[model samples]
Target: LDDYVNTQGASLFSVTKKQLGAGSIEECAAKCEEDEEFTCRAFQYHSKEQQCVIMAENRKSSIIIRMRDVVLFEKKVYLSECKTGNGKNYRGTMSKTKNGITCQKWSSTSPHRPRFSPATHPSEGLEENYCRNPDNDPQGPWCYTTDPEKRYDYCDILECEEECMHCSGENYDGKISKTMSGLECQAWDSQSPHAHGYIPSKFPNKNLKKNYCRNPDRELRPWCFTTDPNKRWELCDIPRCTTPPPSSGPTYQTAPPELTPVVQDCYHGDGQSYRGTSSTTTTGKKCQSWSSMTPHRHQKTPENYPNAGLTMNYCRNPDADKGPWCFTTDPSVRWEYCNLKKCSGETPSEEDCMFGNGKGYRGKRATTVTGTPCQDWAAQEPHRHSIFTPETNPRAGLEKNYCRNPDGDVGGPWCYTTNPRKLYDYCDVPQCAAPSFDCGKPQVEPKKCPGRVVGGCVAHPHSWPWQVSLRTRFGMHFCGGTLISPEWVLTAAHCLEKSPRPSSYKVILGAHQEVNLEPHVQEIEVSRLFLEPTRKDIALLKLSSPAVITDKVIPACLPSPNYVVADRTECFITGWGETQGTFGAGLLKEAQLPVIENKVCNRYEFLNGRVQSTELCAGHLAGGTDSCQGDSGGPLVCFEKDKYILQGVTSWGLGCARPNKPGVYVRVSRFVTWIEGVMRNN
Candidate 1:
């Protein structure tokens, strides 16, 4: 026992085996210990082969291999880094992130579970919570963290040294038990979401485990049959355990855990057949019943086009192509267009190359980079799968076996291989090249906006990233603010009309909902509030620290002081304002209101010259597209040259979306001089 270490299901590979005819485990050990003829250094007891193989080679000199029911007992020696570098061969027991977060057990499930378990990748040596690099990722050893927020991160493990160079080292081989959507991984043994036959019961060698994400014949990384009946399967987006990662680096890299309340709404070309869930206009006013003829009565009634699915108050477009149109609940206002993302490519795009993990990729490429033929998307032959099919994904065109990215795999487009040996692998897709820009430009673009859209349902969750919520210490949302710089937030002076105690306020960036915040939101303390002294009606809140920019928290771009926005430019107003008149919205909403020339707005009866040089107007003359209560201080942005420039700040309006009463904003251009003065000094 002191001279040899035992490894189950392994053997001192076929290196001149000195057959010790029939013998038990202990007897074989005795022969290797007392070896006189050839001094056995290692021995193997193969139950199935019904023999004990003795070898004159130590583990350091001979290879150890996988063998069913065999036990390899080799002469013990010092284990260290192997020659292949990176530590894919490292057999050490490092079970924690370099920063001290405990690694989740490969066999456990709860906070974090992995697909690499001993029962799964039996050859990978996964015995406990030890760190490992089973995928041969060059960054080295890593393990799923115990922290629920973090999936997997790198671990600093000691490399193999020269005293012993062998593959029988402790490794990680557990199956990650959750789908990328965070759904319970389906039992590889049974089919729930759909019928698939890749189970461990049939082909025991595949090492597939119960409903967990895995890569058994080497297709790609881990993936699984998900539990959501609407979804078949998705790639597990566990962050790669790489070298040189910062301490607080991980958050779900894929779409955030999938429980998004604002489940995105989309419109057809010009919205002729559009029937979506947006019940309000850009002004946060509920859409009036198409059947009712009250206040500002109408002719676009449900009885006229009863077949258009125009029964409910939800927005619809039975005629003319401006997308979906809605009858306003504001008695004085008539009808307006609903803000909705143009359903990208039912139809196609310039996405030959991908961005991040390719969740946003809708390109058409089919087959592995190795030229291995891809399996037909419809046929569940060779391997049974439910990832992308007509039943699960209705919008995404997973047509043919073309490499498709329906699950947003970080590795880009991939598919099941016809070659029964491998499961899935990344396609030969490349990363999209980056372009450059300046002021009035945003580096990180929002998802789901393809030339963008307008009217209230709910904007895609981080679509308006620069929008921030100004909240009290008790978490009460008071006003909206636009992130202009990492440390400074721009807003209407009326929001903090006369700067309150800065200590009592906080700015929440990357937020989606007030009652239930999204995972990416960050709360930063307000250090100071700079309310411009003149009639500019603008204010700036200096944060305690710079908000770290991410896809959910980038700053909005600003126009130059001398720049003047053209009239009729379609701009958007976003905020968590009172959409139902009396109550404030818990979720953020956006509306498209084209900028109306101040002269025309000033001529309106409700305003008979209320517009000023320091302010701008952006809304419909017929009503229903203005910003309202609690929306004060949010941004009025217009897209130009691939950027959304902050042109105005939500200021005030008469009686909330009244007929011929457009909303006023603190023209951002007018305050550029004072804004820089305050930011430069602070």
Candidate 2:
């Protein structure tokens, strides 16, 4: 019924009765109408506890819906009690509809599928309350929504009765489902395990095929670098697509059987022990002649089971062109297969072993063959008396034992060793063997020295302040500045920005040393400051008081006004920069460096000079000395009139204490007009 409370405005209408107090639905509506300040469109009430939620328009932050399908609307119940603690909801089984403020409780099947009930949820996971039956069925389990998005407060509880595939991976209170990797399942605290997994259709918004698409252009795209696609993964269609991960499946393997042999004692041409898969090889005992063991050697070539002659090692031809080749039974010989193992006990004769080659040894087994190595008479005729060893194969590139006359060949030719295999026969033959060597004096060895590296960092006074440190405001130390007037202190913008506050700056004059400046310590407050945009990092600080210039303290002069010429010149940077390898001592260090041309400095092998027109570079021609960090904004000064003249403001460098990188400084001559203008404002 449309009941309204005029006194409470619409506040009571939006506030649920359960939020109000434990009362029946009718009572909650009656209370809203009686309160006179607000009205109620719908009210929820707990049957057992009589808790009521009276919601009116514009009353609460959420849009509340009445729960349906549940037998009883009750409060103070555990999620496991829903469908009698079967974990039915998470497995997408049971459903229940209950109207109450969502409050999740520890379920009975907690470790397996713990979740908030009324599965339609605002959060990804469990709610404070879950759906359950009032009757509490013992043998029966009901159906519940397994959709991870169902908010705990938004579930339309139904009678759960369906069976579905349970999620396999980690159950994040029902936030995420089974992904490829365990890490990707984290809806919260994604620190551990590196988040690996597949995105479901409802999640990530990208199609599974599109996500697996592999695109070459993605290699250069910035999207490939970002870990998070910000829910915009569809735009990241590169060739990165892959198939959906396979489910956990079975693995396979095979076991190899042991190999034994028969007829032992096959070594050294004597009765030694033989090892084969057959028992006959293991023990030198015979079983029904050698034919009985032939079955063990079944399915092999005739060469594999040799009766005599060469071992199987040299039986196979080296080139495979010659059929049924073999060498004598020797381990030193190369691999060749023959029927040597089958020929046993002095039967079948040497002619049978030769297999119709028509060559047989009548002696007690010939170890080495006579005549020529190759039986082809035509090929062996030229080298017949030369004693052609196996070394004379064409692959070896030489013929042995040749002696020639030196003057025989024309064109002033000289004799040299003609063969690699033979001892030299001394001869005066041109283009033939010659004298071995002069009956020589002893050879002398010279001392060895390190070779010089070409175009390397040459010796040029290894000095440094090569890098400038631009400290943040959080850093502990501060840089110094020279006061041009009461309202202006000339210094580096890097020093001011690094140290932070324009107001917290302090200036000292006259004394050169930090901490113990002799006789002169000036106290001044910073007023206004000026720094140009592209940091030549040069800035002028306007002070409260002007300095009294005398013998103790003086200002350096600028270069000739309106001068704009590039020159290779040297300058000095004095500051508390590094000496050896670190920030240097309290006193300033002076090092001489030659002014390098911009083009040359840029091509310095190391610097490749990113140097600009607003900057000046000074160092060795080979580059080993330069200003460094904490030297930023100090004067790049040249000697003049017994003092120094400001040439540049020390700016940046490539690296600190490096071999070939010279220090770079902002050109003060270029910024003179800007500096003067800022000074006048201060």
Candidate 3:
């Protein structure tokens, strides 16, 4: 049960393939094991309808919203062999020496040998169970010492000399150059001392025959060769083993520059509020700009003359403590008060009467009471802005007091009107800007595409370019919609009703399967929403920004005013909704459903004769094929002429393809005018 029964949501990853007739959990797991070419890590089984979904990924991502009636299982590739208590194949315990070389021992009665190879004696007089040094280092041979009285028995190996005190004239690892015995510590060779298996600096004895060191006790160590012509001796680099210094201090330090620091100005006065000279001390500290007059460096006087006889003067303050006064470097100048005046280019208060802030004539007569010429505010230039909201209007604070209008000849503060339809009195109303839409052009190419079901086959990816997923804040696919334009989508009003705020939802396009990510998957933010609360169940969403066009994402053709679909015409509905019962397969599934007669749909037992003309009905009367809960707000499209046109949006259904219950959808053709109006006004 280790890889089975994940308490987390079933199929937390994505499903790669779907099996419709899986009767039990074992059947589902068997199908996953049957696939030889692809690996199936986890699977989900719906108990109610006996449907299985196999996933290619084994890891859990986010917790799913639904977690009942379904079971998830993980498959293990192989089982571990370290199951029981007794240690059989475990390697011998090892300990490290001061120089960091690993050391271990095995008794003569033990089954395992401590050295890698079997112990061998080179000659008759030497000890048994010895290891030879492999490289040319100071340590020559190794051996095993045993007491004849059976008091003690152990393996002994030569230790490497500690020359770590000084290497390349740098002290390391807290090892000083002088030892406690007053002996100078030996230094490491400039080049590596552990040479190949060649001549070693030290020899075992003066006799040529005894010069080479031997590994009487076969322990893993280094050795070097003897200079004798017969080459009798061999000593390996293990004798020259060394411990490297521990890395302890900061890699870099903050050090001051050796040269004298250069002086720099504290304030560059060009295009600045304060205009004055800055000075630096002889020791290199920069001084703040001097405010008052003082005797100092060898420089220009109070009046610095750039040209001959043309003196640039500063407006001196009567109180010297008031700080330095302003100045003009222009040759054509005069000594005046140092006060800033409004620029002459700015608009004057009197001339700003045409704008909302100024006093403009409101009376219909030609002149004011003071005999001043009265002008109609509507005759002025229009200041159009986005249909003024509290967040967008620049003068929103003056709305209650000012002559306000949202739709009129001039944008705001204009002639009064008694018309009941007017938004404001004597106020210019703003008009909604029209958007340019790339319509009637889907990105999918015309070719042989797969079928979708209820008599439909699996659809080829990107076959429907306008299909999109409406995801919740948690990124779970909630509903579906159509891409009417680059920045707009059309969905069911009820979908927005559950989560009304625009910030609560995101728009995903170019996504075919639910949990499976596609290369063309694109997600966009919802900025604003337009909902129709009347008998109609349709809503329009404005994207925060335009979506990038690709083969998988494209806008569908909006039906023309005169366009009409014949009775019993076949249309398609697609979404990542439930394939069986309430458990969604998490794959984009499609079905071919014919348009049901409104009269027949109204007569259905569940419909209660409430089917309206604004709604479209699709699917069979016997309930074999229909759009389920998750398919809400998806497209019901039909092929017209040479392109596919959006005709309906999935709205409601009575238990998903049940007896006498067909899926209900919002008729797209009837809402064309409203869709166009909302798009234009927004």
User: lDDT tens string, model 3, 214-323?
Assistant: 23222233122333333322334322224343345789862111111111112212113333222212111212112322211112333452321212232222222112
lDDT of 1 by residue, 1-682 (tens): 7545555445554556687555457767777656566645567776423467877765555554333346666564223332125665565545567788987888888776677887788556664787777888887777888777889998665433122212221121333565555677778666444444253533333335455445543324465667777765566655443223223456885111111113235666556676555564433334567676643334577778777778657767776543466565442234544534446551123446665556666666765756788887788898765445657787667777776777553234667788888666656555454442233344333332211232455666666778878888888887788888889888876766544788888888877787888876788899886777764567788888887766567777877773445555566778878755423357777667666655456553647777655667766656363335337888887654245788888866422454456666778876788888887877
Candidate 3 structure lDDT: 0.45
**Worst 10-residue stretch by lDDT in candidate 2?**
437-446
lDDT of 2 by residue, 65-123 (tens): 21211112111112122221333333222234344233334343432354434344332
What are the models' TM-scores? Answer: 0.36, 0.29, 0.34
Minimum summed lDDT over a 10-residue window in model 3 is located at 255-264
Supply candidate 1's per-residue lDDT for 542: 88
Q: Per lDDT, what order, best first?
A: 1, 3, 2
Go through the candidates in order and give the C-alpha RMSD of each one to the true structure.
Answer: 28.5, 37.7, 38.5
Candidate 2's displacement at residue 337, Å, is: 99
Q: What's the residue-level lDDT of 232 in candidate 2? A: 13
Question: lDDT score, residue 142, model 3?
Answer: 30
How does each model score on lDDT? 0.61, 0.35, 0.45
